[model samples]
Target: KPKLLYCSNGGHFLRILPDGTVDGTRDRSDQHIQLQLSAESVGEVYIKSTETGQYLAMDTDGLLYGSQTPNEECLFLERLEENHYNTYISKKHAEKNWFVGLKKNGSCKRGPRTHYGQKAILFLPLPVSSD
Candidate 1:
């Protein structure tokens, strides 16, 4: 399964590697890169998209979580996904991370396509969650 890539409170930025490892590097000099996630969608929210598609993301310094293959909380990525998803990176910061497509080596996936029109995420073998 593919990993559910995402951004956190707006601090750390990620770039996918050929081995499926997300490379975390410091963002712009002026931006602190503090991205955040809600607590609603924890281990369940896998990165549905890869580094080869088009989407938006930013870096921040909020709480993030990661899940094991069994969906266990081990390390944190951003904080969590929520009904009220609030990405910390503002329009200004978002502009910096904006791209017409992903430059990394991965592919986008089809989500669950829930009744609410939500997409399903693919959970891989990586395990770690943030509190």
Candidate 2:
């Protein structure tokens, strides 16, 4: 099944364009992301673009990007926030509070711990359609 990350606060959905760029868009048509996870490792997962073959990744600068090849940097820690919503934090930058999020303009950005309640870092699952 496919999944979508709905930013309830942002009123947008996490999206990956055909070129592998990551961002948030109000257009629900662009939000389906493929989650790759291992049953043995529930804590770590990879979010791949359904439109592009790239995987969501974060760089040393704490910027989010889409990587063509899967690497440790592409792995994300699925953290269950106190709000019951899940947060996808960069595995390589866990100590730095680097989370996959969007800015006010719907651009891709890194979310810090201070912005935990801003909805910029919070994402809830949007039910997939069978149609």
Candidate 3:
């Protein structure tokens, strides 16, 4: 089973490109995309693209890319905020407080500029129902 990472700020679905890039789109078509989530610890998760088969990873420079495996860079600590929205912060870069953020226009926000409380970092992980 897979899920849809819908951005609260942008109302867009977190998407993975064929080239292993990350972005956001509102489309829900079969070609849009879906995510495969793997939990390694109590609150940590690894996100992968069902379409591209790559892990959602952030580099040291705050650039988001797809990884072949769920390495240290792919680990994200999921936070359920007061608004009931979820924010995923990179564990490897938690010292810097880097978050998974999407802009209002559905563009990617590099890690350095992302903050925990920002709406840009808030998302809702929607289950993909078989029905």
lDDT of 1 by residue, 39-130 (tens): 33532222322333311222231112122232222212322234333222211122232111111232221111111112121111222333
Predicted candidate 3 versus true structure: per-residue lDDT over 1-131, tens digit per residue: 35677777677777777766777775544464676567677458787777668787787767667878677888787756646665777766877888877666857777577676547667777777675
Report lDDT (CA) for all predictions: 0.25, 0.64, 0.71
lDDT of 2 by residue, 1-131 (tens): 45566765776777766664666776466445443332125557777655446677787767777776676777877766646556777876878778767775666665453235566667766556455
Clashes of 1: 47
Among these predicted structures, which one has the highest TM-score? 3
Candidate 1: residue 56 Cα off by (Å): 16
Show the lowest summed lDDT stretch of 10 residues, model 3. Answer: 24-33
Q: Can you tell me which runs of candidate 2 are displaced by over 4 Å?
A: 1-3, 29-42, 110-115, 129-131
Q: Is 1 or 3 the stronger prediction by TM-score? A: 3
TM-score, predicted candidate 3 vs. hidden true structure:
0.82
Displacement of the residue 6 alpha carbon in candidate 1, Å: 7.5
* Error of model 2, residue 55, in angstroms: 1.1
Q: Which 10-residue window in model 2 sums to the lowest lDDT?
A: 31-40
The numbered model that scores best in lDDT is 3
Q: How accurate is candidate 2 locally (lDDT)?
A: 0.64
